[model samples]
Target: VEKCNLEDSACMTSAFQQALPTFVAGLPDHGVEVMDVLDLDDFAFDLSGLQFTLKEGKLKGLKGAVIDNVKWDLKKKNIEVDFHLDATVKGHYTAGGRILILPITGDGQMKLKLKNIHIHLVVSYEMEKDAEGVDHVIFKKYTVTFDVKDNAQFGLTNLFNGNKELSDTMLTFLNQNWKQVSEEFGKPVMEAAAKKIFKNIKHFLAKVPIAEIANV
Candidate 1:
């Protein structure tokens, strides 16, 4: 291992920042998949006014991120990172519930555009080097969260099955109260996306030692 300044958070932060874009670009060789396209197995949310289930969901935007900060504290084995995303998410959905106060039904393609999203995470780690001298970084758990700094725009092709009137109006309602709905509806998708990206970070660190790239 090419050990660098362990006391230099700046160097490590810069080192991590330098590696992130490429990290998000993704590694196709192994457990690393493209960060831009994440498959959402099944996310079903039920609330008093809204209930829906998304299937075969594909969430995009993590790849569009420009990593803003990568704060590293090796002593505590913690890293805090934040990034920005301006993009949309796509999936298939089925809805049969109140869209706020109005009744609604839908089953088709669904899309949501989020502008200027900010995601922050705090992750902990453990280090190990096996018999052959190959190193690994095990990132066990993380606190990941995100926020939409601007607004969210949504579209569900079959909002009312065949009723155009209800479709336009409720979608208008969703857009009007975008902030509220975004916090509730967009949480799971963002959270899942955040975790996967960090898992990719873990994969990258396993092959490349921390001392390899980080230095003054």
Candidate 2:
């Protein structure tokens, strides 16, 4: 039986905060490979890596409501990082059928302020599901992707093309150590996680070119 709580809203908010990190951390890694040769330079133009920083502001629009299918775009020369998110309340509400609304009320919209919290990432490698009911695993073949803002404070030298450098290193590592790569895949762990989170944050912005955003 479920325990009835008249004051469940605080607990729900607290629980969501605590569990978000683990949820972000546990996302599956599929597989990645270089874009077909024709798309290489184009891909390099926009973004090459991805990183998720914590935001300090609260998600303003969403007062108490759940939200889903939120999309964000990151563009690189030939690559794009498109993000889709589905967030919901996986907890109980109050006895009167009203959720414990705090400073605001009703279901909230989908805007998170960049001041109140940090952003963890959901990274990937290939993008395939596992057998039975299991999730995906890292792929021996992998490609990297990420998002970044256009007017970001970093200097020009710390630009997006850095991913190409990293990818080159990864390819060199794979070529030099196919046997090791194979063995690692046999027991793969954090490799895909690294690639996905690293590559996904290159061009993540609140707004991007519509033509580019359409790709994601």
Candidate 3:
């Protein structure tokens, strides 16, 4: 927190990078949970011919993010975090949909592996006083943008009533055109985790004073 200029992108980048380990490890004493993996449940996604919901999911590998850019707007109470998240999400899903000419239906296991994924998130917040009158950051609104750089992959089982032939064929098609599939599917998984990661940042910031982060 010394000799750091919050407005200086380079300095803030390094600061964020250095703080990541501590953030991921978490400060349980301060009401912070581990940031390595996010457990999300009851998440749903739908599209033209498909609709699915994850009953429960475990999204891991968030700590692998490489903090590329960081900027804070203390005046407006907004922050922009640019980073890369290469991770995997595996869990159970209830799916009923169609891909191309095939009728796909399943209620089984799902796994998604996305690599070289670039993430940019802009979050707006406000300072609220706690019961004891201390300051805390309350996230008001946020948005995320993702750009995947590699051929990602996902799998689903028990499609077509356990018909391996149809299931295998469907898997091949999804794996082949993963870019679009990942956009529709893989992106949200990361978004869920990314937003959760920043929630932790909110807590971390609440513990720190504005003067220590930047100059007026």
Candidate 4:
């Protein structure tokens, strides 16, 4: 019986490794409405002397994002999934502020590449009984460590139209200040994305029994 349980656990882990990427790819078709869980309107940040106003952001075409490793611990009743993600955010931003006391307004679409994003997650299952005494699986207490490759692309609007020299200078400034820029803006956006992504994953798993998915 113990040997059989070990085999079952291995099968379950393989299934999850295969299924996670499919779920992530389908997230775009699942529609932005599902992302309301993120509550991004409450998220705000400032960077580079610009007050940013976020209208909406969408993650689409999660290419090359896949599970790199999976570890199942039947004895501990926990599973750990390590994954890498490469995706882009279609960010709609409107910023108005003074750059060196010169008034500026930038309202345009930004193609932000969240390159080589890595996620490590530990999940455990719980069993709950309803008033009817029917058992249901609850996947909770998700501990996640989300990291991104320092190299990211920020395609912004031409703040200074037709001025190549000034545009080059501005780009250079942003690259030099990338660390501060990421702390002020990139981190919050990433947090929102991570929460939304995992919430959807939890919702998907809720429909399937924990026993069916893993040995839990």
Clash count, one per candidate: 0, 58, 0, 0
Highest lDDT model number: 3
Residue 152's lDDT in candidate 4: 62
lDDT of 1 at 85: 80
List the candidates' TM-scores in order. Answer: 0.85, 0.18, 0.84, 0.68
TM-score rank, highest first? Answer: 1, 3, 4, 2
- For residue 171, give model 1's deviation from the true position in Å: 0.8
lDDT, candidates in the order shown: 0.74, 0.25, 0.76, 0.60
lDDT of 2 by residue, 1-216 (tens): 112131343443344344334333322342222211101110111111211111121112112222221211122122222232221111111111111121111121212111111123333333234454333323232343222221111111111234556434433443444343233221211232334334432222111222232221
Q: Write the per-residue lDDT of candidate 3 for residues 143-204, one digit (tens) a residue.
A: 88888888688778777889999889899988888887766665566666666776777777
lDDT of 4 by residue, 1-216 (tens): 111232354554556656644555555544523442233433455666767666577765443456666676656757687877766666676656754334555666766666677778888866666576545555676676766666566666755653666656655666665555555566567666666666777666555444455443
What local lDDT does model 3 show for residue 172? 90
CA RMSD per model (angstroms): 2.9, 24.4, 2.8, 5.4
Lowest lDDT 10-residue stretch of candidate 1: 1-10
Local distance difference test, candidate 3? 0.76
Residue pairs in candidate 4 whose N, alpha carbon or C atoms collide under 3 angstroms: none
Q: Ten residues in a row with the worst lDDT in model 2?
A: 37-46
Worst 10 residues of 3 by lDDT: 207-216
Model 4 residue runs over 4 Å out of place are: 1-13, 25-43, 47-50, 61-63, 72-79, 96-105, 122-125, 130-135, 158-164, 176-180
Screening candidate 3 with a backbone cut-off below 3 angstroms (N, C-alpha, C), the clashing residue pairs are none
Instruction: Write one digit per residue (lDDT tens) for candidate 1, span 65-96.
Output: 67677676777987777777887778888888
Error of 2 at 180 (Å): 48
Candidate number with the higher lDDT (1 or 3): 3
Off by over 4 Å in 3: 1-3, 74-77, 126-139, 212-216
TM-score of 1: 0.85
